Amino acid sequence: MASESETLNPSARIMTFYPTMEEFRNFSRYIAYIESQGAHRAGLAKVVPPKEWKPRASYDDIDDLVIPAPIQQLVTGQSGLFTQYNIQKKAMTVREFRKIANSDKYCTPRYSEFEELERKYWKNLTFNPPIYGADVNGTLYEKHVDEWNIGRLRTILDLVEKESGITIEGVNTPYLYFGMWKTSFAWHTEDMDLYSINYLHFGEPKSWYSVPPEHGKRLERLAKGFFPGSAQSCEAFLRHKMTLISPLMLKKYGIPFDKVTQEAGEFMITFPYGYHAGFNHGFNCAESTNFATRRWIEYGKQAVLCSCRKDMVKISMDVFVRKFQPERYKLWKAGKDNTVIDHTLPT
Amino acid sequence: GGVK
Ligand code: NI
Ligand SMILES: [Zn+2]
Numbered sequence: 001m002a003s004e005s006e007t008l009n010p011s012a013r014i015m016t017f018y019p020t021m022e023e024f025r026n027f028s029r030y031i032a033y034i035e036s037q038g039a040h041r042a043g044l045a046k047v048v049p050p051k052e053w054k055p056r057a058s059y060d061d062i063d064d065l066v067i068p069a070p071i072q073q074l075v076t077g078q079s080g081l082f083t084q085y086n087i088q089k090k091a092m093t094v095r096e097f098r099k100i101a102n103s104d105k106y107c108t109p110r111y112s113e114f115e116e117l118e119r120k121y122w123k124n125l126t127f128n129p130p131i132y133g134a135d136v137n138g139t140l141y142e143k144h145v146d147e148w149n150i151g152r153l154r155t156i157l158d159l160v161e162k163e164s165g166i167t168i169e170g171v172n173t174p175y176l177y178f179g180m181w182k183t184s185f186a187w188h189t190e191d192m193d194l195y196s197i198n199y200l201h202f203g204e205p206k207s208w209y210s211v212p213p214e215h216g217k218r219l220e221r222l223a224k225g226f227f228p229g230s231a232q233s234c235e236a237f238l239r240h241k242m243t244l245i246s247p248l249m250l251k252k253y254g255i256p257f258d259k260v261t262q263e264a265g266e267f268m269i270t271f272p273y274g275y276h277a278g279f280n281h282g283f284n285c286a287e288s289t290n291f292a293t294r295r296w297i298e299y300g301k302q303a304v305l306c307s308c309r310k311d312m313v314k315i316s317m318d319v320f321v322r323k324f325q326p327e328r329y330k331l332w333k334a335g336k337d338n339t340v341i342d343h344t345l346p347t
Numbered sequence: 348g349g350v351k
Contacts, residue, residue: 135351170351191351290351313349 009038012212035346043274044210047267067133080249101180101283108282133178157292179280191313193299194290203284213273235307272299
């Protein structure tokens with residue numbers, strides 16, 4: 001009855017992969033592999049790299065590195081629905097950040113198991129606004145690291161800079177994130193509904209929520225219903241990355257979602273149109289960027305973009321359609337391309 | 348273009 005791809009990961013659950021060193025070396029081959037297993041159906045996958053693999057010898061020299069725009073996260077709301085406001089604070093070093101993160105005021109509360117920590121997160125997220133060293137331009141990777149180097153993954157997203165010279169910070173260049181307890185990332189898909197890779201360099205875990213691409217529209221419909229003012233002002237208000245929605249709120253409205261906790265030394269991959277949100281457990285450092293595969297192309301063509309801010313990420317799809325969909329270029333350009341996306345299909 |  002059902003198709004081959006529809007049969008793989010039928011519950012759209014977050015999958016975890018443990019590649020051997022051999023399997024790990026070819027990044028784009030490995031992405032294609034995990035999609036052949038239906039990982040993309042979750043919106044989010046975990047990749048644990050081989051034990052004898054490291055992106056950096058040590059993180060002992062990084063104390064003096066600067067965070068030029070740390071933000072204080074003022075969260076407003078109740079009953080599982082919140083809006084996060086970012087207050088930009090003055091530049092600080094990693095050392096100045098770590099001292100504050102581990103200080104009694106801002107540190108992780110004691111707890112037995114994740115569910116307790118998670119309950120404390122949703123209970124206290126509007127109190128004691130934390131500071132996130134978010135969106136810091138840079139890599140922690142060593143120059144010679146050729147495997148899964150966030151600074152040079154060599155996917156087809158490279159065609160953007162290749163074609164145009166255009167660098168989009170955090171999208172085709174890496175970002176670093178210095179977290180503390182209760183720092184959050186709001187519900188969003190990537191810019192242009194791209195993939196992302198996130199590597200947690202060191203520190204306390206980062207917890208993630210995901211909604212399957214298959215159910216993305218369901219999440220948006222809920223969001224639009226809960227924030228009708230924001231939906232009137234913007235065609236894609238979730239891209240403001242201000243909207244927090246607890247897992248209990250999602251259960252209540254029957255939106256499928258899954259959860260994963262990422263540890264130090266683990267990769268998270270998000271897939272096109274996979275909505276994700278989450279929080280940090282304590283002091284930590286993550287590195288991320290966006291990337292693409294041929295399967296992204298149609299998502300990029302159909303991505304609904306923020307209509308109310310001028311600085312938003314906007315990639316010309318022209319070069320991708322021209323190069324990888326030549327049959328459809330003339331049709332697409334005349335606005336007559338009616339391709340429906342199958343979220344289960346790989347490649 | 349833009350910024351993330
Ligand atoms: Ni993301
Ligand atoms: Zn907008």
